[PDB]
Structure 1
């Protein structure tokens, strides 16, 4: 696949990581794709990539940094995206990492 078009659906606060990502992988054969993303600024949600062939393979991604930039390693390449991780509502909770 190529064309690493990341559709970061929500840039959360946030909590346990969760948040929106979707690599629009221009691929001919979906399957097991490399998921774990090359940037420690926001913690990734999932580990492998269910690759929709030519599809927006969705993914979780959680970063608490309000000026977020998510640079993933979507198996056949990197993937660039940046969304504002808009801060959440509550104050104290189970966990988060980003």
Structure 2
């Protein structure tokens, strides 16, 4: 969590460092009521950050 603001809007930011098997696009979610995400899917390029 490179930034977190406990707020009504999406005040929380988190970076995921990834090492993907092949570049493309795929979804992201939180199986819990703790956090609600603004975006549904992200794009990935080999190994990097999103």
Question: TM-score, length-normalised on structure 2?
Answer: 0.71
Q: Where is the strand percentage greater, Structure 1 or Structure 2?
A: 1
Larger radius of gyration: 1
Instruction: Give the CA deviation at 1:37.
Output: 2.2
Alignment of 1:1-98 (within 5 A): 8-57=1-50
Contact 1:9–1:20 under 8 Å retained in 2: yes
Instruction: Give the CA deviation at 1:32.
Output: 1.0
**Matched pairs, number:** 50
Partner residue of 1:61? none
Q: Report the aligned-residue RMSD.
A: 1.7
Which segments of 5 or more consecutive residues in structure 2 lack a partner in the other structure? Answer: none
Instruction: Give the CA deviation at 1:21.
Output: 1.2
Which segments of 5 or more consecutive residues in structure 1 lack a partner in the other structure? Answer: 1-7, 58-98
The runs of at least 4 aligned residues of structure 1 exceeding 3 Å deviation read none
